Design a protein around this ligand. Structure first.
Ligand SMILES: CCCCCCCCCCCCCCCCCC(=O)OC[C@H](COP(=O)([O-])OCC(O)COP(=O)([O-])OC[C@@H](COC(=O)CCCCCCCCCCCCCCCCC)OC(=O)CCCCCCCCCCCCCCCCC)OC(=O)CCCCCCCCCCCCCCCCC
Ligand SMILES: CCCCCCCCCCCCCCCCCC(=O)OC[C@H](COP(=O)([O-])OCC(O)COP(=O)([O-])OC[C@@H](COC(=O)CCCCCCCCCCCCCCCCC)OC(=O)CCCCCCCCCCCCCCCCC)OC(=O)CCCCCCCCCCCCCCCCC
Ligand SMILES: CCCCCCCCCCCCCCCCCC(=O)OC[C@H](COP(=O)([O-])OCC(O)COP(=O)([O-])OC[C@@H](COC(=O)CCCCCCCCCCCCCCCCC)OC(=O)CCCCCCCCCCCCCCCCC)OC(=O)CCCCCCCCCCCCCCCCC
Ligand SMILES: COC1=C(OC)C(=O)C(C/C=C(/C)CC/C=C(/C)CC/C=C(/C)CC/C=C(\C)CC/C=C(\C)CC/C=C(\C)CC/C=C(/C)CC/C=C(/C)CC/C=C(/C)CCC=C(C)C)=C(C)C1=O
Ligand SMILES: CCCCCCCCCCCCCCCCC[C@@H](O)O[C@H](CO[C@H](O)CCCCCCCCCCCCCCC)COP(=O)(O)OCC[N+](C)(C)C
Ligand SMILES: CCCCCCCC/C=C\CCCCCCCC(=O)OC[C@H](COP(=O)(O)OCCN)OC(=O)CCCCCCC/C=C\CCCCCCCC
Ligand SMILES: CCCCCCCC/C=C\CCCCCCCC(=O)OC[C@H](COP(=O)(O)OCCN)OC(=O)CCCCCCC/C=C\CCCCCCCC
Ligand SMILES: CCCCCCCC/C=C\CCCCCCCC(=O)OC[C@H](COP(=O)(O)OCCN)OC(=O)CCCCCCC/C=C\CCCCCCCC
Ligand SMILES: CCCCCCCC/C=C\CCCCCCCC(=O)O[C@H](COC(=O)CCCCCCC/C=C/CCCCCCCC)COP(=O)(O)OCCN
Lengths: 105, 318, 113, 171, 83, 98, 347, 115
């Protein structure tokens, strides 16, 4: 079913391309390199069954970096509250958020 | 100010196409011991204006059996793509500066063929269908060779950016390093623009008018404009690719003059070639591209991959 | 035939020699300007750090003002369990700004031609 | 999940370097020769800490070193340098090669007034060593404790008691 | 020796395109392994600094790492200028 | 997720549905197969670019290579079916039953 | 077809399967499936005729659809975790799509319609290949991702496969369609035990491949593809029909024959996981396969059908070609039950 | 954003030329005039009948050789790598199998058109 010829011969036929944290050209990093490094090191050698429970924190952080679902939710909440308080005139946006900032290098 | 530049590029190109028609008529005339247009305007200068005005005041007809939507779309696509193919050409600066300008040229050219195919099919006429199938065959004949020739020539350049070709040739024309690829490329551009002896799609002797036989008036003039624009565009590209003109940053007009002279020479060479030779049979063109050009092109691609490594001559800008 | 082939091969060899010299010089020039970029990079990194941190602080203060009435909202609460620094998402940095800055930040380089 | 700590806008202030990219490119080689020490300190901080919030003082030292460098240039020959960076600035790619006379004049100027030698080809790209008092960060990833492994295999291998024990087989 | 002679004769007489193609392909295959400059090309590619050279923390036990770019230790590109 | 991702997955579903529901011509089904490949190429490219997995930039090209092989395979079979029946209709191939 | 070309194509089919079996990357597994299909289409049409063309066309359409679905599942899995390694799928929707794609590649019910038609449309050698070697790759992939798969969908498709194999086999007089429905039911048995013990899947697959190779080689040796054409073999080669009779009973799963071992092992493993009901259904339904095997044995070996006069001429000629592994295959198909504890070497 | 403006301008100019061509001149369309052209006479069959393709095999081969171009276009960038011996070996290997597939179809009469 899975004859691990690569591991028996030490070949690396396709393992160079399986993960995002593995030796990219010119050392260009993946967007989620640290999260994946952490999740891989947390779950290494403990087996699949233990890794899903005991490394769920690292994997949840990794998935958040990948898809950013909670970040978009928080931004949407903030902007809805801003829209609501602006419509009634309660809140006034600062100049550096309207296009009149003092830009810095 | 950018629309000013767009119009600055387009209005002149259409005028140059108009007068390329006159230059071709006169050059073929003098090679045939006659004169060509010398009556409408001094030295036939007003002949293109008369032709255009005559074509756009004549009745355009939609064939009864034709698919009207594709019938009308095909010339629009032809002319709009012919105009679009000019925007990345560095003369010495391009209107649009692209990282992959050569590859954009390839894709737009490859899309240009559909207008001929669609127009022939939309017409629902026998001769139009025969012309369209000849166009299918022509693309199959030259498409693979043309791309690999560009790749081989471009290896020395280091990228697909068209403006880098000026720096690549600061001291020598790239034709002194690849004149075999230059020969095969010239013939492939003859085939790619449907020009004698490779102009099978029109098939004037064989199919009367080929794909555009049904077309009349303004729609017909649009196909004509597109073809002649493509003839100038291909030659200009050939000039930039194989005969780089020295460019002075503080005086780009010198580069512009040099570049225009070289593209005019190549266009006149197309006209000369048309005046000199018999037409290729369409099956023969495929044999010519697949049994002679493709083996040499594969070998020369191997050679041009190996050569910069053998000699430590690999170019910059990965 | 010999003469034609000989002229052709001689032309090719001259061209090869010239291009070899010119491309070696070009590679030296590329190394030189790459090294200029290398000498300049620390200053750019320092001011990029300060710019990112300032934008995040401004967003934090505006969010402290905007989200005061909502009952159970921690201002500046992270969405990650980890406590290490996370590179800010583009939306977070420019979330509360004008559409022109957001366009320039997302598509400015892609569209520049 | 915890609040993100950010520096106040006061601690993010610095005397900026407000010269354009052509000026920076015209000065880059001598600037990398002269201000190497604080720049390398800052980059080592930056790449060991993996947090921009932990290397603000090094960045401010980077700014002050750049400003001192440019003040020296302004004090000893602004005119050859201005010639040089104007030549550089005309180019749309900002190419060093089209300006060799101006670069030569600027280089002689700095060599005679300040004793500045332009680095040779291949030197600014060396990996160098930095001596620092900053302690090496221990857990820059803020890692959790790793879970314990499974115990291990141990002991001598004895034949299975009563063989396979499949329904009726005695071996 | 004489079989292949007349064979290449007939090929040059009947299919010079294929003859030239096989010659150019074979040269492209074999010549790069006999060249003294292939290593020069590898070295030129290795000397191109695409990314920032991250400095090392000095521990007092690095005699061959420079402490300033213009120090004599580290790689040299002198071979490249004379190339 | 983003609106763009939803649209590409919808394109795959529509092409899959098109392949599943046959009409008369075989060529139309072959086109649907190509459409599925096109949507897979776009989806994988978007995911790869977004997460900056650098080495995975080559897998959409491999995808295209195999897609071309499949397309070529499909056209060969169509040539043989048309040579048998003078038509590329699905209804003609009913010789074998269950 | 040139013999060298045929060898190259068989080697490409096998190398695509081996690529599926040795790869750690989902893209390489997909490439293995693609290469296998590419080389396999010409092998179906080796003997050209409209039926072979139709069979290859139905096969290509089914397998290419499965391939697109498989790729889509891989891409969704990557979207929800930046992973290319084939371990356990991260997304439930990707797992459903993957399971259905592999079921279509195997021909499990309700995707079973293609197997009888394609098998009938091709020669006996191509049918042998299609029903033995073409199962290894999807089964190995399913064995790797077994923990991730949902039991309800898998067991539904497996029970459907057993039922539909039996019912469809009851109606056939063509031997290739009988073999195809047999294969469908056997696949159902292999996949029913997959979420519990992949070693039982491997054991079932090995015994099924042995019995199927024996049956196809016996059908080639006596060049028959219908029931009535096989009814003549007694009047030319009685040993062949006796051996086929015993092989047929082994397929039926009757003890003390080898064919009974996989059924026996699978039922026992399932009972351990507190699943009494599914197995009772499976065995009582395999009774149908046994019925139509017994019908074929009645017409072929246990009675003597009338014959023709021209058979006398065939009496005078020996078989030109002899199969080297046919004798071994029969012995392994019938007499291997006393060696059952050797299954531990499979895990 | 500039390329979008360029494409819009070009398509708009061409469409306006078509509009002028159809709305400026006098129109006198009748059935005889709008009928299909076949050199003096009425066509026998339809132009939508199947039109046999004698180069059908070169057309399928073009599909596979066109994807060889997608694998060879990154070669200018591949030349910048450090292990040039592996890159050159791989690039050479790719073109050799492209030459062998051309030699196979050529020697098996696959480039000859159907008769
Ligand atoms: C959401 C809806 C989607 C929007 C559809 C787009 C607009 C097309 C609808 C109008 C065309 C039909 C008019 C007609 O039938 O005769 C007119 C009228 C009726 O003549 P008739 O003799 O009485 O009757 C003829 C029969 O009824 C029938 O005669 P027929 O045989 O000509 O009918 C066929 C026609 C009938 O149309 C239909 O059947 C229904 C329309 C649905 C078509 C949409 C299908 C999806 C195709 C691809 C998606 C394209 C984008 C759509 C999204 C819109 C946003 C951009 O179908 C078409 O040909 C539509 C072609 C549109 C595709 C244009 C793209 C060109 C490709 C360029 C290269 C690509 C580059 C890469 C990008 O005659 C005229 O007025 C003269 C011709 C007018 C045509 C002008 C240009 C055609 C439309 C331009 C396309 C827009 C491109 C931007
Ligand atoms: C030449 C003769 C020769 O060299 O024989 C030496 C050999 C020396 O015997 P030994 O180990 O000194 O005697 C130990 C006792 O026989 C005591 O024997 P054991 O306790 O070592 O028995 C070994 C064990 C394992 O033995 C086996 O699995 C194979 C034995 C044959 C199974 C019966 C079916 C074939 C007849 O037997 C079983 O587990 C019985 C299960 C067999 C039935 C399998 C289910 C299907 C039955 C067919 C319906 O004797 C034989 O080989 C007798 C024939 C076998
Ligand atoms: C474990 C799982 C359990 C077992 C698996 C299931 C078993 C099912 C196997 C079915 C095989 C089908 C078959 O071969 O014929 C059916 C055959 C029935 O046919 P038949 O009625 O006898 O007459 C057919 C005639 O051959 C009519 O055809 P013909 O007249 O053209 O005769 C030509 C004949 C005579 O052959 C010749 O003429 C020899 C001339 C040599 C030509 C040189 C060509 C070499 C160039 C090509 C290189 C390609 C390399 C690929 C590169 C890939 C790159 C990635 O050649 C053949 O018959 C086929 C040759 C088979 C080649 C086997 C070599 C193994 C390939 C391994 C590939 C793996 C590579 C590494 C993978 C790494 C991962 C990527 O079945 C049998 O004869 C008995 C069954 C035996 C099955 C095996 C026994 C079980 C295991 C022990
Ligand atoms: C062997 O006989 C033949 C020839 O030899 C005598 C030919 O020349 C010949 C070629 C056809 C010629 C008669 C040339 C015809 C000239 C064109 C059709 C006129 C095209 C000119 C306009 C349409 C261009 C647009 C006009 C503007 C002034 C350009 C600017 C555009 C504005 C927007 C500004 C053919 C086909 C031929 O068969
Ligand atoms: C280079 C590209 C750009 C060039 C720049 C110029 C852009 C030109 C755009 C193309 C149109 C020019 C075509 C020239 C002729 C006009 C065609 C048409 O528009 O005119 C008539 C349009 O008239 C309509 O038939 C009905 C008339 C009124 C319709 C009511 C519309 C609402 C207006 C309300 C009236 C109140 C005053 C409006 C002004 C404020 C059509 O009549 P018709 O005979 O079939 O067509 C043949 C035209 N002939 C005779 C010249 C040969
Ligand atoms: C000024 C008068 C304006 C009239 C507008 C009428 C438009 C129209 O469709 O009418 C049909 C009109 C003339 O026919 P009749 O009505 O019979 O005769 C008119 C004279 N009595 O036909 C036309 O000219 C249609 C011309 C096309 C208009 C432009 C829109 C076409 C869209 C093409 C999209 C495809 C572009 C593809 C290329 C781009 C890809 C990069
Ligand atoms: C039609 C085919 C579309 C192809 C357009 C290609 C244009 C192009 O290559 O420009 C590239 C340019 C810059 O790329 P770089 O080379 O990396 O340089 C800038 C980075 N510093 O990229 C861009 O500007 C992207 C702009 C948006 C893309 C345009 C999309 C066009 C799609 C056509 C759709 C037609 C309209 C919709 C309906 C169509 C049919 C009715
Ligand atoms: C839910 C699904 C459960 C599956 C249970 C399967 C039971 C196994 C028995 C299979 C019997 C199949 C009989 C059949 O299909 O056809 C009836 C058959 C058709 O004749 P053919 O030989 O096929 O054609 C001759 C003309 N050309 O007609 C007959 O005469 C049948 C004669 C023998 C029938 C034997 C039935 C014995 C049943 C004993 C009782 C127990 C049976 C199993 C169910 C037990 C109750 C839960
Ligand atoms: C090791 C180098 C490999 C890489 C380089 C090659 C890359 C691309 C070149 C190869 C492309 C494929 C070539 C396919 C060969 C087709 C052979 C064939 O059948 O054509 C023959 C024509 O060619 C032949 O005669 C058959 C082979 C004869 C020899 C051809 C060249 C073999 C090698 C010659 C040179 C040897 C090496 C070069 C040494 C040069 C001297 C120093 C028949 O012609 P038709 O078109 O059918 O004519 C129809 C009308 N009558």
């Amino acid at each position: 079913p899975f004859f691990d010829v690569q591991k028996r011969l030490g070949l690396d036929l396709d393992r160079w391309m399986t993960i995002q944290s593995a030796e990219q050209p010119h050392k260009i990093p993946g967007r989620c390199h640290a999260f994946e490094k952490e999740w891989i090191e947390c779950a290494h050698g403990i087996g699949g069954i233990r890794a899903e429970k005991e490394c769920k924190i690292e994997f949840d952080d990794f998935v958040e970096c990948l898809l950013r679902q909670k970040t978009m939710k928080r931004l949407s909440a903030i902007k809805r509250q801003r829209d609501k308080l602006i419509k009634e005139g309660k809140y006034t946006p600062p100049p550096h958020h309207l296009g009149k900032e003092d830009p810095r290098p | 100010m950018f629309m000013i530049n767009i119009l600055s590029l387009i209005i002149p190109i259409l005028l140059a196409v108009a007068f390329l028609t006159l230059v071709e008529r006169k050059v073929l005339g003098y090679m045939q011991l006659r004169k060509g247009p010398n009556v409408v305007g001094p030295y036939g200068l007003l002949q293109p204006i008369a032709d255009a005005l005559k074509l756009f005041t004549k009745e355009p007809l939609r064939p009864a059996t034709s698919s009207i939507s594709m019938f009308i779309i095909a010339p629009i696509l032809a002319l709009s793509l012919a105009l679009t193919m000019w925007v990345p050409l560095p003369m010495p600066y391009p209107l649009i500066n692209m990282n992959l300008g050569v590859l954009f040229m390839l894709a737009m050219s490859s899309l240009a063929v559909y207008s001929i195919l669609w127009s022939g099919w939309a017409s629902n006429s026998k001769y139009a269908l025969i012309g369209a199938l000849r166009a299918v065959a022509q693309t199959i004949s030259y498409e693979v060779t043309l791309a690999i020739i560009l790749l081989s020539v471009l290896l020395m350049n280091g990228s697909y950016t068209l403006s880098t070709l000026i720096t690549t040739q600061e001291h020598i024309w790239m034709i002194f390093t690849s004149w075999p690829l230059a020969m095969m490329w010239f013939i492939s551009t003859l085939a790619e623009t449907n020009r004698a002896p490779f102009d099978l799609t029109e098939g004037e002797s064989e199919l009367v008018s080929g794909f555009n036989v049904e077309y009349a008036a303004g729609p017909f003039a649009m196909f004509f404009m597109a073809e002649y624009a493509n003839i100038i565009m291909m030659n200009a590209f050939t000039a930039i690719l194989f005969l780089g003109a020295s460019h002075d940053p503080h005086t780009p007009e010198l580069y512009t003059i040099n570049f225009v002279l070289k593209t005019l020479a190549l266009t006149i060479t197309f006209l000369w070639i048309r005046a000199s030779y018999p037409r290729f049979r369409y099956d023969q063109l495929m044999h010519l591209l697949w049994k002679s050009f493709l083996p040499l092109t594969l070998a020369l691609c191997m050679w041009h991959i190996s050569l910069p490594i053998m000699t430590a001559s690999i170019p910059p800008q990965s | 035939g010999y003469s034609m082939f000989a002229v052709g091969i001689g032309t090719l060899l001259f061209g090869y020699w010239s291009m070899m010299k010119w491309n070696r010089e070009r590679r030296r020039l590329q190394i030189e300007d790459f090294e200029a970029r290398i000498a300049l990079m620390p200053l750019f990194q320092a001011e990029k750090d300060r710019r990112v941190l300032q934008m995040l602080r401004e967003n934090l203060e505006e969010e402290a003002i905007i989200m005061k009435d909502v009952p159970d909202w921690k201002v500046g609460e992270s969405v990650f369990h980890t406590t290490r620094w996370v590179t800010p998402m583009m939306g977070e940095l420019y979330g509360l700004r004008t559409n022109e800055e957001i366009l320039s930040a997302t598509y400015g380089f892609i569209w520049y031609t | 999940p915890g609040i993100v700590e950010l520096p106040t806008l006061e601690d993010l202030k610095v005397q900026e370097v407000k010269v354009s990219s052509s000026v920076l490119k015209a000065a880059a080689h001598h600037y990398g020769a002269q201000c190497d020490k604080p720049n390398k300190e800052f980059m080592l901080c930056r790449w060991e800490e993996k947090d921009p919030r932990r290397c603000l003082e090094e960045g401010k030292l980077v700014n002050q070193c750049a400003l001192d460098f440019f003040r020296q240039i302004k004090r000893h020959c602004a005119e050859p340098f201005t010639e040089y960076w104007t030549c550089i600035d005309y180019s749309g790619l900002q190419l060093f090669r089209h300006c060799r006379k101006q670069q030569a004049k600027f280089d002689e100027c700095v060599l005679d007034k300040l004793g500045w030698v332009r680095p040779d080809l291949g030197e600014l790209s060396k990996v160098t060593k930095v001596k620092t008092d900053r302690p090496l960060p221990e857990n820059p990833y803020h890692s959790r404790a790793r879970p314990e492994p499974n115990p291990e295999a141990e002991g001598d291998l004895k034949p299975a008691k009563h063989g396979s024990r499949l329904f009726f087989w005695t071996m | 020796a004489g079989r292949i002679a007349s064979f290449l004769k007939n090929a040059w007489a009947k299919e010079p395109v294929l003859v030239a193609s096989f010659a150019i392909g074979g040269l492209a295959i074999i010549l790069p392994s006999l060249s003294p400059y292939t290593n020069y090309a590898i070295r030129i590619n290795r000397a191109t600094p695409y990314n920032y050279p991250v400095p090392l923390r000095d521990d007092g036990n690095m005699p061959d790492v420079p402490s300033h770019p213009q120090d004599p230790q580290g790689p040299s590109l002198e071979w490249l200028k004379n190339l | 997720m983003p609106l763009v991702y939803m649209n590409i997955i919808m394109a795959f579903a529509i092409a899959l549905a098109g392949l599943l529901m046959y009409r008369s011509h075989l060529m139309s089904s072959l086109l649907c197969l190509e459409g599925m490949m096109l949507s897979l190429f776009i989806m994988s490219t978007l995911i790869i670019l977004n997460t900056h997995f650098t080495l995975a930039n080559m897998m959409p090209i491999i995808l295209l290579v195999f897609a071309a092989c499949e397309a070529a395979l499909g056209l060969s079979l169509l040539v043989m079916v048309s040579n048998t029946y003078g038509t590329d209709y699905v209804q003609n191939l009913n010789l074998l039953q269950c | 077809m040139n013999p060298i070309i045929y060898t190259t194509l068989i080697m490409t089919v096998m190398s695509g399967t081996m690529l599926v079996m040795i790869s750690s990357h989902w893209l390489l597994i997909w490439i293995g499936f693609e290469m296998n299909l590419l080389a396999m289409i010409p092998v179906l049409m080796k003997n050209f005729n409209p039926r072979a063309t139709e069979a290859a066309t139905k096969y290509f359409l089914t397998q290419a659809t499965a391939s697109m679905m498989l790729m889509m599942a891989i891409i969704i899995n990557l979207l929800y975790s930046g992973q290319w390694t084939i371990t356990k799928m991260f997304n439930p929707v990707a797992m459903t799509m993957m399971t259905m794609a592999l079921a279509m590649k195997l021909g499990l019910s309700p995707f079973h319609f293609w197997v009888p038609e394609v098998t009938q449309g091709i020669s006996l050698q191509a049918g042998l290949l299609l029903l033995t070697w073409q199962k290894l790759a999807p089964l190995s992939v399913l064995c790797q991702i077994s923990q991730s798969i949902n039991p309800n969908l898998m067991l539904t498709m497996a029970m459907l496969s057993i039922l539909i194999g039996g019912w469809g086999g009851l109606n056939q007089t063509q031997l290739r369609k009988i073999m195809a429905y047999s294969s469908i039911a056997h696949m159902g048995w292999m996949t029913a035990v997959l979420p519990y013990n992949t070693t039982m899947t491997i054991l079932n697959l090995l015994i099924y491949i042995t019995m199927t190779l024996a049956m196809f080689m016996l059908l080639i040796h006596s060049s028959a593809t219908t029931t009535l054409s096989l009814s003549h073999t007694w009047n030319k080669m009685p040993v062949i029909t006796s051996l086929m009779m015993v092989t047929l009973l082994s397929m039926g799963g009757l003890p003390p024959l080898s064919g009974f071992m996989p059924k026996w092992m699978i039922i026992q493993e399932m009972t351990k996981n507190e699943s009494i009901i599914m197995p009772t259904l499976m065995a009582m339904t395999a009774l149908l396969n046994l019925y139509f095997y017994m019908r074929l044995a009645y017409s072929s070996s246990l009675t003597m059908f009338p014959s023709t006069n021209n058979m006398k001429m065939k009496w005078q000629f020996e078989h030109t070609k002899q199969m080297k592994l046919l004798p071994t295959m029969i012995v392994l198909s019938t007499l291997v039950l006393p060696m059952t504890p050797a299954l531990s070497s499979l895990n | 954003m500039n390329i979008m403006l360029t494409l819009l301008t070009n398509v708009t100019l061409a469409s306006l030329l078509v509009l002028i061509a159809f709305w400026l001149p006098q129109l006198n369309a009748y059935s005889e005039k709008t009928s299909p052209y076949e050199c003096g006479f009425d066509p026998m069959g339809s132009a939508r009948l199947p039109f046999s393709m004698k180069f059908f095999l070169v057309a399928i081969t073009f599909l596979l050789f066109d994807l060889e171009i997608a694998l060879l276009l990154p070669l200018p960038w591949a030349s910048q790598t450090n292990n040039l011996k592996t890159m050159l070996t791989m690039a050479l290997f790719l073109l050799i199998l492209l030459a062998a597939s051309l030699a196979y179809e050529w020697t098996q009469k696959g480039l000859e058109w159907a008769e």
